[PDB]
Amino acid sequence: VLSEGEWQLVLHVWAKVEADVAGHGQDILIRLFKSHPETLEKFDRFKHLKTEAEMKASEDLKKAGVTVLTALGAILKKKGHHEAELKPLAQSHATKHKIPIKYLEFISEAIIHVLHSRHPGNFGADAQGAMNKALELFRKDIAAKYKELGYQG
Template identity: 30%
Template sequence: MALSAEDIQTVSAIWEKIYADVEDNGADVLSRMFKEHHHTVNYFKNFTQLQSVAETASAVDIAALAEVRAHGKKVFSALHDMVPHLTNVDALKETINPLAKKHAAELKVDVKDFRILFENLLDLIGEKQGADAKTAFKKVTDLIYEEIKAAY
């Protein structure tokens, strides 16, 4: 699925606003994933704070954890590296492939859990920028998800 020049301009503006608050937004997306899909906590066994509070803490409390904030920033930075490549699928693949391969082979993350992450990102975009922004950015998450899946 290719994005039009207008799509890219729109989603780049959406992403710029979301990325401006990278640490809070990244932590928010991850904490929602952990609360709504508890099995995803298992991927982060080395996050001792998360492991100790995951079952009882609220999403807000989880988002405040330093390790969740740092990883949320890392996830959003990876996405930030992908957005400029939306015009060039080959360059996008080059950016995604190492990340996907590491998550598949080394970290043993189920590819379906990327869909969960993207759903939470889209919900955040919808809350902060409205339904039209959410709909527009879904094209990006669909494209990235398909490329991640292909690399698995």
């Protein structure tokens, strides 16, 4: 359970993300796909992309990045009261897309990497710790939902 001070660290860096959600989404998806190339295989519209340049030029990848970060943002803004948001997301990611928890860990690591690179003014150790706690909460609650839904994860 996060403190209010922890949530405020999360939401203060999130506010900078929101200055340019598309750009942050490109950087985050690209980092995930470079760091864990097996994750790209889940994305049928652009799994054929071979290079970072191709990835940066992809309008479909850009839209996916906007979608992920906007949904995550909405969850973070609930400050842990995210049961309603998590229901459809857990169902799609468990049953349609088949995203294991380990892949949710990889995208969390990609998020942290990019925020650390882009936002050293709002992403020092305490803020990174708060973001990691928020993302660990998200993953814990999604994993519990996966289990309810019948998915090993």
